[PDB]
Design a binder for this molecule. Structure first.
Ligand SMILES: [K+]
Ligand SMILES: [K+]
Ligand SMILES: [K+]
Ligand SMILES: [Mg+2]
Ligand SMILES: [Mg+2]
Ligand SMILES: [Mg+2]
Ligand SMILES: [Mg+2]
Ligand SMILES: [Mg+2]
Ligand SMILES: [Mg+2]
Ligand SMILES: [Mg+2]
Ligand SMILES: [Mg+2]
Ligand SMILES: [Mg+2]
Ligand SMILES: [Mg+2]
Ligand SMILES: [Mg+2]
Ligand SMILES: [Mg+2]
Ligand SMILES: [Mg+2]
Ligand SMILES: [Mg+2]
Ligand SMILES: [Mg+2]
Ligand SMILES: [Mg+2]
Ligand SMILES: [Mg+2]
Ligand SMILES: [Mg+2]
Ligand SMILES: [Mg+2]
Ligand SMILES: [Mg+2]
Ligand SMILES: [Mg+2]
Ligand SMILES: [Mg+2]
Ligand SMILES: [Mg+2]
Ligand SMILES: [Mg+2]
Lengths: 183, 63, 133, 98, 138, 62
RNA sequence: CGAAAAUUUAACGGAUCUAAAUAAUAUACCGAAACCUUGUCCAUAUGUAACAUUAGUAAUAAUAUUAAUGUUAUUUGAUGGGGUAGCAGAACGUUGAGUGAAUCUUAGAUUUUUUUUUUAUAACUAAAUAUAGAUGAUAACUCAAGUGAGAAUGGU
RNA sequence: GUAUGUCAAAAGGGAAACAGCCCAGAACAAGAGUUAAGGUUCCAAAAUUAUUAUUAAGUGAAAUAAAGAAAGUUUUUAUA
RNA sequence: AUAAGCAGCUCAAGCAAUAAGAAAGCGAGAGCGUACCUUUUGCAUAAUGGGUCACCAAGUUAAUUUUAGAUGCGAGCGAAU
């Protein structure tokens, strides 16, 4: 029981993560060679990763009942990477229980009214548990079409270097070497 | 779930990767700096008296 | 006995010098991560013990501190640590009733279960000095 | 029929893998029983029949590991998983030609 | 040599004859291990249930008390100190410390025989009004 | 054996009678064999009982 | 491509997937009330020791033992564990009756509740409210039944 | 009708949901325990695990629609 | 008062005692779970029966003929004198 005794303030805090839908991802890409052929994370492979963060499942204290999820700011959703002809052949449906009122729309036609952010919210929404926390978690996914967003100051940092920045890894290893100078 | 045992399995979280690398045919001391905030009882080397022999280089420099 | 590794003989003083220490004792093969002063409630009635008996635990899987961690392949050597506990008595649970029933059958068979549990108290957990070994 | 017995016509790579290991485990039971008797200079009529008219997993074609003969099918072949107790039964040889 | 036969699967949906072959082998429940000599009569008995058991040659037969000792975990504790217990059929057992080593059990029909402090022993301790600890000890 | 006093007793609902038959609703005659003729009819009764014979009380020498 | 049906995408479970498809392979992991381990309950055997009761046989003025029954522990580290129709065994509870001209009760019997503990269809501890000396209650053993109800378009 | 099993009278895991199918026979608890069928990107416990080919149609991915057509594509065997 | 629970079970934040000590109860949130009985090969079935609660309400008695166990007597038993 001692493992849990302590200050759990920072274990439950909301971290503001960031990812660009255009930056190549060696881990979430199916093409891994050559270096120039690596593609960004596909729609479903990016949503599968985000849904894991919104559920807080990346934390060692995850519990499905506690809403220990985090925020995820997705940028460049206009350049959402998709394979095949999904952009023009995939269809989204709707019905309000009135016979004949079946609304259909393609991915590209849906990206003209509400942009690529709406296509990613539907992918993440289906990957989340269908319960009373689905709308709270999906609201923590802030997707934008370009590189601009109001959370450029919220993104988690480490020594002034935003995570995902060019030199963010060096700033982390420098802070841990200073923490070892103690009993 | 239906039973308290089935719930424990669904809510399982595996131990840290450092503990899985268990030695074989021998005992060893591995260095696992946790991703957590240290308490106040880990006095920094700057507050230790000059006489305290515990003053020593970082544990990383010992490996 | 098998000599202790040279790497363990040089880093154990650093492990025993840090503020806090924990251990993963193994009672009948099952692990229990405990610290000096913790109250372990075993899920069984240990036979042949009375409140006030001292037990010497000798099967430790992992003994570590914040930064360092000693791991024995099968188990950590007994000569390195010394963990003891005291039997705090026995405790019981409230009687729970299980009703085994099938649809369209009136017979309801009852199962009354009320198990006892042995409660321990870790009163000593220290790391020995192996300067001589 | 209106009663749904949802059984796919083909097996998955996970079922085919376990099938390979079951065909491989029965080969070790006959090899152990045969080698144990050979050391004593003995023989069993059932063990001599198996080694004579039954192949090993390393000698069977993929179509004999995941399929069986069925005269009611278009091409006289039927998924082996459509056999009763197919997991605890031996089936390795089909009629010649089919 | 012997056959170390272990029942890996069940026969809940196999013909009745398959149960007769498992009963003759002695495999009542799952993962149960039995030892039979290497003979044609036992060999052919395993060819009928070869899809359910795991066979293996062993030099000797393991007794019943030796088959269960290989799945038994180490207790992980050793009683080094005991308190005064009353055994129903043996009498009062005085406290013992195994670390400094003595199970002495005193029985009788009088309190003095049990070896415990009685009311008589408590009155002599109160009348020793002259006992005093050393000056340095205070 | 008190029948009709719950399921756990073992004789609760039908009291060991079965389910909706003639043996559960009413009574079956003892001499009834389903309609098939008994043997005492297909064969007939044999002999007569002597009502005039004396019933001696036997006594042996031993 | 052939391939068209009437509430709605409409037999990938869904999101989605260029494999997270398909074919031929390899390994690790997950995975049931299955199995294992540590304990518990119940049933049925095998010996031994001890505790209690009942009834016998001995001993005792200067306690031992035999048999039955109940119970706990222990030996073989004993064996066994779904269940309808149905069969069988062992118990509890309810009503009245005998021992009973008995036992207990203002130092609180009895109080349809609440609470507490015990392997627990039951009883028990305590608390609160009221106030009975017997037309009150009651253990234990035994006797006899108008003896146990979520089910009958049941009856009041 | 016959042969075998299950259901009936059998809970539990898998087959999205499921009397009869694949596993497995529930006395009660504990365990990142060991396994069967089955599975391991997310819903949802576990591989976005390795190797070699094919498909570009979301074909298909846990209920194979047919004959048949065709400079779709790949391989192999011939052949210029 | 953003939610689609045969209202129970598994996990469980939080609230709850003016005070030393002492947490019953209610429970957000996560998961599992389609009443009961009857009758049927098979029923959540849109098959039968019940508005709820309390009470009444169903293998009993007699004679006769058997079996088992226990026990009395015993080539006699029982009854009655
Ligand atoms: K009926
Ligand atoms: K499709
Ligand atoms: K009645
Ligand atoms: Mg249908
Ligand atoms: Mg019955
Ligand atoms: Mg009957
Ligand atoms: Mg009867
Ligand atoms: Mg009948
Ligand atoms: Mg679909
Ligand atoms: Mg079991
Ligand atoms: Mg069983
Ligand atoms: Mg009252
Ligand atoms: Mg009366
Ligand atoms: Mg009624
Ligand atoms: Mg059966
Ligand atoms: Mg029936
Ligand atoms: Mg079933
Ligand atoms: Mg599935
Ligand atoms: Mg595991
Ligand atoms: Mg997962
Ligand atoms: Mg609300
Ligand atoms: Mg019908
Ligand atoms: Mg109805
Ligand atoms: Mg009605
Ligand atoms: Mg009414
Ligand atoms: Mg009345
Ligand atoms: Mg009545």
């Amino acid at each position: 029981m001692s493992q849990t005794v302590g200050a759990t303030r920072l274990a439950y805090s909301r971290v503001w993560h960031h990812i660009s839908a255009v930056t190549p991802h060696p881990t979430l890409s199916t093409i891994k060679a050559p270096s120039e052929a690596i593609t960004p994370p596909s729609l479903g492979r990016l949503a599968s990763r985000i849904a894991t963060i919104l559920m807080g499942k990346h934390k060692p204290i995850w519990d499905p009942s506690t809403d220990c999820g985090d925020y995820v700011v997705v940028t460049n959703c206009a350049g959402l990477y998709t394979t095949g002809h999904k952009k023009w052949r995939k269809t989204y449906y709707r019905h309000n229980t009135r016979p004949g009122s079946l609304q259909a729309i393609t991915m590209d036609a849906l990206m003209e009214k509400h942009g690529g952010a709406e296509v990613l919210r539907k992918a993440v929404s289906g990957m989340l548990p269908k319960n009373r926390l689905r709308d709270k978690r999906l609201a923590r996914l802030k997707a934008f079409e370009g590189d601009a967003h109001p959370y450029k100051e919220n993104l988690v940092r480490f020594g002034g270097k935003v995570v995902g920045a060019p030199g963010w890894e060096e700033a982390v290893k420098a802070i841990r070497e200073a923490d070892m100078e103690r009993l | 779930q239906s039973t308290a045992n089935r719930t424990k399995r669904m809510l399982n979280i595996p131990p840290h990767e450092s503990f899985l690398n268990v030695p074989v045919e021998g005992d060893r001391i591995i260095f696992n700096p946790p991703s957590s905030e240290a308490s106040v009882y880990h006095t920094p080397f700057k507050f230790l008296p000059r006489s305290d022999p515990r003053r020593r280089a970082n544990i990383y420099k010992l490996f | 006995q098998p000599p202790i590794s040279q790497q363990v003989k040089e880093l154990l003083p650093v492990l025993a010098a840090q503020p806090g220490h924990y251990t993963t004792i193994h009672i009948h093969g099952k692990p229990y991560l405990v610290t000096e002063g913790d109250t372990v409630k075993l899920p069984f009635k240990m036979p042949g013990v009375a409140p006030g008996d001292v037990l010497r635990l000798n099967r430790a899987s992992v003994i570590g501190s914040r930064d360092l961690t000693l791991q024995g392949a099968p188990y950590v050597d007994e000569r390195l640590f010394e963990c003891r506990a005291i039997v705090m008595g026995t405790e019981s649970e409230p009687m729970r009733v299980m009703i085994k029933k099938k649809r369209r059958c009136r017979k309801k068979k009852h199962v009354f279960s009320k198990h006892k549990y042995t409660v321990l108290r870790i009163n000593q957990l220290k790391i020995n000095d192996v300067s001589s070994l | 029929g209106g009663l749904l017995w949802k059984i796919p016509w083909r097996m998955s790579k996970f079922q085919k893998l376990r099938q390979r290991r079951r065909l491989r485990a029965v080969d070790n039971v006959v090899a152990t029983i045969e080698n144990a008797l050979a050391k004593k200079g003995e023989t069993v009529k059932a063990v001599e029949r198996w080694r004579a008219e039954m192949p090993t997993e390393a000698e069977m074609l993929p179509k004999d590991k995941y399929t069986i003969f069925d005269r009611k099918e278009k091409r006289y072949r039927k998924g082996i998983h459509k056999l009763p107790k197919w997991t605890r039964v031996s089936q390795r040889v089909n009629p010649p030609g089919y | 040599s012997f056959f170390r036969i272990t029942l890996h699967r069940s026969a809940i949906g196999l013909p009745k004859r398959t149960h007769g072959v498992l009963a003759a082998l002695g495999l009542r429940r799952r993962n149960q291990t039995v030892f039979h000599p290497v003979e044609p009569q036992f060999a052919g008995m395993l060819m009928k249930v070869k899809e359910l058991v795991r066979v293996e040659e062993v030099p000797h037969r393991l007794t019943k008390r030796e088959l269960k000792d290989e799945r038994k975990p180490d207790a992980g504790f050793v009683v080094e100190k005991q308190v005064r217990r009353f055994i129903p059929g043996v009498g009062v057992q005085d406290e013992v410390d195994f670390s400094k080593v003595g199970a002495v059990v005193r029985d009788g029909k009088r309190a003095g025989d049990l070896g415990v402090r009685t009311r008589s022993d408590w009155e002599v301790i109160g009348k020793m009004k002259s006992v005093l600890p050393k000056v340095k000890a205070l | 054996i008190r029948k009709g006093r719950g399921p756990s007793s073992g004789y609760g609902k039908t009291a060991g009678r079965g389910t909706k038959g003639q043996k559960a609703h009413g009574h079956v005659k003892p001499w009834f064999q389903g309609g098939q003729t008994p043997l005492i009819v297909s064969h007939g009764r044999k002999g007569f009982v002597n009502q005039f014979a004396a019933d001696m009380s036997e006594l042996n020498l031993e």
